[PDB]
């Protein structure tokens, strides 16, 4: 909803944010004493939830600035994945491929909404076949 992307670093030990175009870089947590080895990350409302291989726990942090991330289910192994399960975490929109598979012979894959002259999808082909000149029909690769 803010059009931002959050990523974590296991080597420089930070959590940082940029806009969908890479502008306006900001740091939400950094230092070996706070985020020694983050692996996974997810967010909901104002919180970022990340897993760290060094503290071996899922952590909670403010999405803006965290002085000391709080613990969440400390574990005896490397926590490998985290994601928040909620309806607002998957907003609601119309798929261009809903209209009779977008006319694609085999596979219909989304794209940027402006792409393909505003259709917002391109036809893709399975392994055994290739896309023809009309970029709609799939023929066997030779």
């Amino acid at each position: 909803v803010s059009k931002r992307v959050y990523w974590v670093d296991s080597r420089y030990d930070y959590i940082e944010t940029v806009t969908y175009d890479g502008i306006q870089r900001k740091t939400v947590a950094r230092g070996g004493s706070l985020v020694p080895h983050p692996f996974g990350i997810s967010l909901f409302e104002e919180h970022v939830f990340f897993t760290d291989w060094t503290k071996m726990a899922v952590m909670k942090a403010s999405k803006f600035t965290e002085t000391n991330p709080q613990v969440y289910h400390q574990s005896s192994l490397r926590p490998h994945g985290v994601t928040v399960y909620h309806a607002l975490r998957q907003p609601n929109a119309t798929n261009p491929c809903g209209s009779n598979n977008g006319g694609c012979a085999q596979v219909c894959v989304l794209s940027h909404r402006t792409d393909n002259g505003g259709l917002g999808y391109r036809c893709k082909c399975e392994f055994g076949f290739e896309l023809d000149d009309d970029e709609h029909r799939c023929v066997a690769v030779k």
Partner: protein
Amino acid sequence: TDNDCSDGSDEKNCQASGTCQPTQFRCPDHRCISPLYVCDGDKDCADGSDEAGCVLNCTSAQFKCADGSSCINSRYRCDGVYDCRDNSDEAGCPTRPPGMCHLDEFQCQGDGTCIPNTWECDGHPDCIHGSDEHTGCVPKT
């Protein structure tokens, strides 16, 4: 900051309040590190303090590229591959004198092909017209 213990013991109680051990380098407000990672070639520090302005000590078993960026093993000097970024490892290497072969090698009389010296007088005609098994070849028993 790395879980080398596989139990997180080595990174416990490592708050920002403290110092590095005598045998460690310090990254500015990031981590302590092994001195082995100082001038290893790549920046471990957040601000690259570990790789800041230090110079290479390439050994006799290695060759230093002309640009002084990095050193490579002596085996890769004059091999036909540009291991150095500036192609300095293949610059100034030996060649055969024109139309001829190294002081080492043997030359085919048929077509001027250079062959290894051992392939003169080893029983097998390794040359197009048998130049390397001439009548002057003393045989073996």
